[PDB]
Amino acid sequence: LLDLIWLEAILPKTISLAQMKASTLVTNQKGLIKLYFLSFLITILISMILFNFH
Amino acid sequence: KYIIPTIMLMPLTWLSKNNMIWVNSTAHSLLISFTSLLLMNQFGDNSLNFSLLFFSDSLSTPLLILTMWLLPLMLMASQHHLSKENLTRKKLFITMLISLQLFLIMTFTAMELILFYILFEATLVPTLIIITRWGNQTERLNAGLYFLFYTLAGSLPLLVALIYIQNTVGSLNFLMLQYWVQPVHNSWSNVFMWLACMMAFMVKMPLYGLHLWLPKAHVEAPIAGSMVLAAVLLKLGGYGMLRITLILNPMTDFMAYPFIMLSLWGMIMTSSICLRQTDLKSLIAYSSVSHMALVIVAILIQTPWSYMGATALMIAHGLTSSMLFCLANSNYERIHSRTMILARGLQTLLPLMATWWLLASLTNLALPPTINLIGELFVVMSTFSWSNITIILMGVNMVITALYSLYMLIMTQRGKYTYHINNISPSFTRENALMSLHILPLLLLTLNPKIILGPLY
């Protein structure tokens, strides 16, 4: 329970989370210059309104 | 005087012919270990200074002598292993052990917090290569990955801590300079300042939590039971705890109170698991958690008695646990599986080794005063001044320390060995030499260990 499963678990949790959040950036947006440029319009809109610098 | 003879040991192995190698690496390291015992043992009223800070001095470090003593002892054990491999890789390997010992000389001598840390992490890379190559067992990569996953995630918080302290108060560099020390006022910003300095040495000094770093490195051994002595040096490599608690934060030790409690169950529950396990190396690996947990209990109390017991225990464990790994090496080189149930029977095949089994197992217990009793007894007497209830928890540990040694003995005293056709030859001349060169320094420290337990003693 403790020395092998539970006391380990804390950082294997962060390993499993890092490997799961890896797919949301690597496997996401399969090709297409359309999909990459569409996200660039949003980043300008965030910088103008949300993360406001005049 | 300890700079550029170990660096001069580097071209020795490359230049020497294929017939020699092992004869040169051992003989030109034993005379180097003689000079460490010759010069470093001298002390004045307080801490000296050998040179300007590239490598500084000794304050409470006879632990440097132990590394110089293991400088040829690792080469003794890896003789049957790496005998069938390439001659160029033999020259490559000995230099990697030398490089480990090179940075280990540096870390103990240098009285810095900045130069110490980067060479404390410079011992991590050679061990990584030593573990992940020549590993006899499968999934040795998990022993390599978690070696740098647990340590570096705890130690990189030192960069944000140590540089922060020197930006506020003078400079950490010279340490004897660092007596500009202001008492920590116990603020919420100072909470993580204390934690980041400790968590780096909560990994190499194994607690109950974050302790899985150790047994995986021992079960998936670097080399059989030969390069495990370097991992014993990494256990005592967390001696920065002696310096951080004393200098950087003496006032605020309210946060030390939960960490003693966490290591208090890192005494009983770490010894309970070390009773049923099948691997003979793991029965040393989990016992090494408990004996090094004694120091973590001691240091955080910060009483003068605990420092006397701790510094003794750092030297005590460095020669007793490493000796037990040499016994595990002698069993693994014959059977080629570290199963305790399978390898059963001494005296019928190994008569002389059985006496060396006793002088190594019983040292886990408090024998007639070697260094282990002197190490333990001062810590137990220090915990009573902290709190009266401690000996009830500490007394259970004293029972299971007998369940360490005798259980290792009984499972080897049972005379059978029916399935075993091997282990026909008793022992080599170098095999019994490992048993002597580990135990006889412990036997010589029975007489006067004044130059062992010495933080102002």
Add this chain to the structure above:
Amino acid sequence: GRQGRATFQFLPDEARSLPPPKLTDPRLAFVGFLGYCSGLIDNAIRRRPVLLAGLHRQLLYITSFVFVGYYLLKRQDYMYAVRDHDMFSYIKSHXXXXXXXXXXXXXXXXXXX
């Protein structure tokens, strides 16, 4: 910190060539070891027998790292002096910014155990 009364073209200033240069320094010897080390692994990548005993183009490898390293250390001895000089001159000119406090035996709390 940043450059103020200094200009580019020719790396040392020549106008501030007063400080003595590094003569047979341990810093020069370590780069000399790296110059030798670069003359060891060149026989390892390009397959040549014996790193210690091989072809003698290593003399170029030793000299180049020493030559570049000498002027690099000359830049180090210059820039550290100027950074210190501008620091000392700032205290001497303003005086009000850097305050001095002397002679104190102030009471502090004593810790138990």
Add this chain to the structure above:
Amino acid sequence: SSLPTTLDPAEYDISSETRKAQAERLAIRSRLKREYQLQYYDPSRRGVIEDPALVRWTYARSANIYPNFRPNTKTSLLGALFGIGPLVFWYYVFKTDRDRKEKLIQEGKLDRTFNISY
């Protein structure tokens, strides 16, 4: 732990269908024995044999950490109660002893006269 009398001549079928099953026990036993016997009585062996029963025995304890325990049930939380529980238990033991000691130092002296230690 055994509850009634020591089980050896108690509770058994009187030579029914179990006799065919008991004969099957010796068939598998001798099958593993004969391959052991062939790899034992030769002088040209020299070396400890594998025996897969003990190899899988070590693998059952050392490995099977994350292939197992993938359904983290309420029983694992009950095991966690024995995990974190005792660590928080001593927090109300050591602190109560310390606040008893520290108050005795300041008001109504309880310190020893011949205490040169620590």
Add this chain to the structure above:
Amino acid sequence: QPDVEWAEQYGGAVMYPTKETAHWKPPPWNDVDPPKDTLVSNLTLN
């Protein structure tokens, strides 16, 4: 000791299996070949 099964698990595709990426085939060893089939290929006059 590492074997052929360990190399297949760390095979050149996507490192770890994913539900989104499965049709993503591994590239050729050296210099990719274009789809040369179906082109203009010499226009005719009448």
Add this chain to the structure above:
Amino acid sequence: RWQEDPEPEDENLYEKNPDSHGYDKDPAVDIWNMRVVFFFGFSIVLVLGSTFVAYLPDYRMQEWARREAERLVKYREAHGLPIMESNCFDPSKIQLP
């Protein structure tokens, strides 16, 4: 099937061929290594080394303070009134308020 991997090696000599040896390959070098140079480090560093571990390095004023304390006990008892301890480091220093 691997067609290249199946080639196991199992050769533990120890006694068969060299008769008396600590390690394999070259018996003449083995006697000079396993029995000579290992034992010179076993003799010099452990026996002649033991005359440096605890035997006369003076060592942080352990025996020096005995001659220092004995002359100070007789001095402050015959001439002085307090018995060697009363106030530490500060005789009438600057007060807190």
Add this chain to the structure above:
Amino acid sequence: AKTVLRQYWDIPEGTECHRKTYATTSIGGAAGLVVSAYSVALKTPTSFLEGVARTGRYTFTAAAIGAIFGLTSCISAQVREKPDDPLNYLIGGCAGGLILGARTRSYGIGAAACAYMGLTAALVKMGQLEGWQVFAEP
């Protein structure tokens, strides 16, 4: 928005509860729209049919994270004395991080995030002191 984040450090100074919950949903809802904005660019099948469903699964949940974190902050303010504590808003982060496993039926991902969200949100309330600054000029 920077104007909404500056309002977040003025309402807990008093004892206003009904406007504090709306201030947290305006941050969480907008931050929910930011995360969902990238998800539109990940090839949405059938435009303005499942793309609206992809916004509806993220923006509603993230605002509900802010809603519970907003509500539990007010419950912890009324019950027990001493308003400024890191432990006081640690339970608020735990309850706010509890419904991460409410998006999908698993009860394990949300339970693992309960300790992580509870500690990280407590650090924000720890960051009211001078010793914690994310961005600096000199």
Add this chain to the structure above:
Amino acid sequence: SMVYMNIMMAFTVSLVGLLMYRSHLMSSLLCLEGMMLSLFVMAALTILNSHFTLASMMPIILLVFAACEAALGLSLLVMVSNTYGTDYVQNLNLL
């Protein structure tokens, strides 16, 4: 103030027009011409109103480097129509 409210607006409209796609890769390069055209007018008004005289050569140089990109990038577009049948954003191979 008055004119700059339209020519800056025309730049932002073309900025959307570049990054928005309907599979045609020719239209993106056509908008790159418009982007340089909008930059040409915005630079012209700043130099002509505030009589610089020296800076008048700068949009002429800008006009040269406008056509430098809008030809060498256009030549790569032809290479897509050599390897593949017709130019499309959807027609890709890279991962």
Add this chain to the structure above:
Amino acid sequence: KFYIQEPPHGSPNWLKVGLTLGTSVFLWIYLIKQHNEDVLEYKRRN
């Protein structure tokens, strides 16, 4: 072996060997003479 089937390198270059051994000495003289000049410059300035 005797370097059979046309050896690519036997190393009797003397063109590259003469320059590598040459310019290194030219670097040695250039560094010491400027160091001797700087030693005179350090004494003259201060």
Add this chain to the structure above:
Amino acid sequence: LLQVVRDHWVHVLVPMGFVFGYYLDRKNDEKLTAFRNKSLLYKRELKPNEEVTW
């Protein structure tokens, strides 16, 4: 004389390397010469020999 140089080419380097370390660390004493005769702890006016402490 002729056989010793070929057989023991590396055997001399390590003890000679110790001598190099014995000499280099000794030469660091001249760098630390501040308050050698000064500072009241072991200070005494030496007459037969110049600079007692090294």
Add this chain to the structure above:
Amino acid sequence: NPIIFIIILLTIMLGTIIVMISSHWLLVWIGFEMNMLAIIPIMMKNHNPRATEASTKYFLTQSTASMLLMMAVIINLMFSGQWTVMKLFNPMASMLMTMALAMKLGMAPFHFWVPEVTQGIPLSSGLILLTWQKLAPMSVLYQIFPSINLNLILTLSVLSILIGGWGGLNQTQLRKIMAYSSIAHMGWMTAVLPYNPTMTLLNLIIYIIMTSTMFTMFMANSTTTTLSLSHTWNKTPIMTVLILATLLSMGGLPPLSGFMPKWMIIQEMTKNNSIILPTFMAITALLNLYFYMRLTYSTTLTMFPSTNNMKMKWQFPLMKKMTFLPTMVVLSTMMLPLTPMLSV
């Protein structure tokens, strides 16, 4: 290709010189677009479908990058009207300046082109010309170090190491790992720029040399982890030792001189009362190390990539700076820690 390949290569060298030695705003504008015309022919080279796709994806992202940069130049005429590269003098133009330079570099939001451009490059000679190209936008950022807002630089530096640290975990392509270490290192670049503009130039020196040592050792043709696997036994075993010195140095390890940037970037930041950001830097840097952790196992282990075909003839590549530079890349932390002053 004869002299014309060298002339094209020399105009990239000359192109960055116009960026370096400059005072005029349209002069650096030319310097960026001098590179745009000159990288593309080396991007093509071997007449590939991948090369055509990479160059078009490279151009359409970086042509828009320059035109966004020219907008910042024109707003510098709308307000103030001074054409000297020192300050933007605007809270609006500074936004369109930093984000345009982020497009040319491997910074967080405009990173999507970087891995797919690196895959389409035919040879190792062309792979250098992206790591060396990043000197040009960095040189401008050093010139305009004030008047640029923290809220839209430091957010782009923090996110880039986050997406860089997770962007190479699900990748086996050797080009793709180097492309995401590029995104990872750019976060360490721009984080220094407000907290003293110095050390950003030294961070380039460490990065450019350490990346050039990789591809010159990748002259023995390898595109995947499994293709670089057959190198331990079929090819030379000493080559695996020297790549080990470059793999481990790219991650944060103190015995190697790749820790020398991570030395001063944390040190300079901690001086200015910021501790919560350098903590986030070092922890995410372990994810960058983690790529090389699994990539060291291709060289340290056997891994069984034997292959029946064995090479008898010795390998003869270019190896121009493959010997001098890895010696400096492995050890310089003990050699020159005072080089901070010499560089900047």
Add this chain to the structure above:
Amino acid sequence: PLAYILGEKATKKMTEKSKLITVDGNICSGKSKLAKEIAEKLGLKHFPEAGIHYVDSTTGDGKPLPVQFSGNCSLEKFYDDPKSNDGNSYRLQAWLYASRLLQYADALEHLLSTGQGVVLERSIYSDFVFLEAMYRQGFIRKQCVDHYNQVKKVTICEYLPPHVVVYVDVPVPEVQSRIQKKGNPHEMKITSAYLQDIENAYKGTFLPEMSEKCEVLQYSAWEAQDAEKVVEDIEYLKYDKGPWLDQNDRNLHKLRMLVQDKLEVLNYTSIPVFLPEVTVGAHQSDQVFQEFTELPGRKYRAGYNEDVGDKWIW
């Protein structure tokens, strides 16, 4: 090799009365050896057919390496009587393809530098005939052929021009009697159906070889062993509108740079795809590579070695 801007250039004092003439398609018996030896009047250099010992013969030093060190359990005698269960079959063919790629790279380098008529005995474009005939009967697994095609698609496309003149020899089905007449105990007792399938597959392989704008010429057994008839046909027939005719500045130099080093051309030959027949084991290959280092051939460098030459250390 790198600086060709001076006197040394491609197609300079070359590519006139000098062409690659491949003599291939000998069915099973060594019939191509007689035709290549006879064609020595017009052609300057005639290379022998690649076998098991060719890889050590070229680039090494005269004498071939032993069977254990050169090709891991690879022998021509094993393929003479091919059998199932962990045999050679495919791994000898992969070694045979690597040797034939090596000899073609040397021949093309010999053609570009100093223009000479090169005669080759069975080239790369005849190798798939030798493989597919073995596949028709139960010898090679299906997955191994697809592994070969992956090497085929990469290695060939590096070379822009295939051949100038390709010689086709179609003998009678009674060629097994001619193989029995020849003094070879190993070559004898081979399958008659295998040799018949080799001639059948070659007929469908000669058609794309002729359509690839290379001058293909067919010869009979009666037309064979003629020094006058074969040489006159080679001089009269001129190569027109072929892939061999290319630009000397761009196409020829890139071909010469790729063929200059043997390791660069064979870099694509080593495939990362794991195959059980293509030798995957590293434990025995470690000692085999160590035995090659122990061997007094090369071991130390590309050219100079200890106890072999070395006039000077520098």
